[PDB]
Amino acid sequence: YSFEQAITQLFQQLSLSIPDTIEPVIGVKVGEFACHITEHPVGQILMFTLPSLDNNDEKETLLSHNIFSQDILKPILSWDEVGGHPVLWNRQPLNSLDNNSLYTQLEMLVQGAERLQ
Amino acid sequence: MGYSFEQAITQLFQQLSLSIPDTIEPVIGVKVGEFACHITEHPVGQILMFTLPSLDNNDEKETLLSHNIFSQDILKPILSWDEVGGHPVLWNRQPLNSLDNNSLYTQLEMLVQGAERLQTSS
Amino acid sequence: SVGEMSGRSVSQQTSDQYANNLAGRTESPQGSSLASRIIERLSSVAHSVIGFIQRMF
Predict the structure, then answer these.
(1) Cα distances (angstroms) measured from residue C1 to each of B8, B17, B32, C4
(2) Lateral strand order in the sheet of B46-51
(3) What family does this chain come from, according to its entry (chain C)?
(4) Which residues of B touch A61 (CB under 8 A)?
(5) Considering only alpha carbons, which residue of chain C is nearest residue B108?
(6) B40 and C23 in contact by Cβ < 8 A?
């Protein structure tokens, strides 16, 4: 899989019109979350979105979302200091993708975003 | 785990001048300086390493979460919290069939460097 | 030199009960939800996203 083939297959599974040109950074809207997919670093498919965090949540509660599990697609909660925004993301190797990998990754990312609400 | 984990640990121990145990347990403990680190295969096909870091109380949520932003290095450790045991947890992970520099040495070094950074109290 | 990394001496340590348990940590999966949602190909990009994007991309 190349980035272009992975994206094209994803869009087709999502019943989305295929872009005449597949840009290096793709944007998909699932419900209220605008997700972004890109290859960074080379050989890795990165997906991310800007969720809405809860004040009530303390550092411990926010950090609890980042504990590892058996699912490597579980998203990581982070913060973009420079832009002053929280960033939720997940990532997996392009060289081990199968037909359903990117769809699963996107699903896990959004489910992660929704939980934070 | 299995043979792949066994071989990876054996290679790592050779690069660290550590005697090779007669039995390689599923969760290997390696103390690097003042950091007790753990290495295991979890889930299958992935090498997971983790340690319990010392956090600075003067660091707020935004500051702590900032450490988790993605970068160009997939071995950059993630800072998290284990609610069940009540401990902060710093961890990194990589494919067992795709080991950086064909070894675990760099993953462990990146974990300890991540811990050293957190130990700092501005 | 030999037997060290990050200017620190290295040694093997028997893992304790807490480390062994945390190492096998699993989380029950969540049911599907992508198929039952309004999905659309982004027509535009937010402001805070462009900067972020062009900043690290």
Answers:
(1) 22, 10, 13, 6
(2) B78-82, B87-95, B46-51, B35-41, B28-32, C8-13, C4-5
(3) Belongs to the YopE family.
(4) 81
(5) C5
(6) yes
Which residue of C lies nearest to A70 if distances are taken between CA atoms?
C26
Joined tokens for residue A34: 């605008």
CA proximity to A96, closest of A43, A54, A52, A59: A43
Q: How many CB atoms lie within 10 A of CB A56?
A: 6
Contact A79 B68 (CB under 8 A): yes
- Find the residue in A nearest to B66 (Cα): A79
d(CA A5, CA B23) in angstroms, rounded, equals 45
Residue with tokens 């590892």: A68
CA B40 to CA B46: how far, in whole Å? 8
Nearest to B46 among A57, A72, A81 (CB): A72
Both structure tokens of C55: 């900043």
Given in angstroms, what resolution was this structure solved at? 2.0
Q: How far is CA B33 from the centre of its chain?
A: 14
* Residues in A touching C29 (Cβ below 8 Å): 71
The range of the structural domain enclosing residue C11 comes to 1-57
**Distance between CA atoms of B57 and A66, rounded to whole angstroms?**
19
DSSP state of B46: E
Nearest to A110 by CA among A14, A29, A11: A29
Which of B32, B50, B82 is facing C8, going by the closest CB pair?
A: B32
Write down the experimental method used for this entry. X-ray
**Cα–Cα distance measured from residue A59 to residue A31, given in angstroms and rounded to the nearest whole number:** 27
User: By three-state DSSP, how is residue A106 classified?
Assistant: helix
| Domain total of chain B | 1
B60 Cβ under 8 Å from any chain A Cβ: yes
At how many degrees (to 10) do helices A101-115 and A3-13 cross?
70
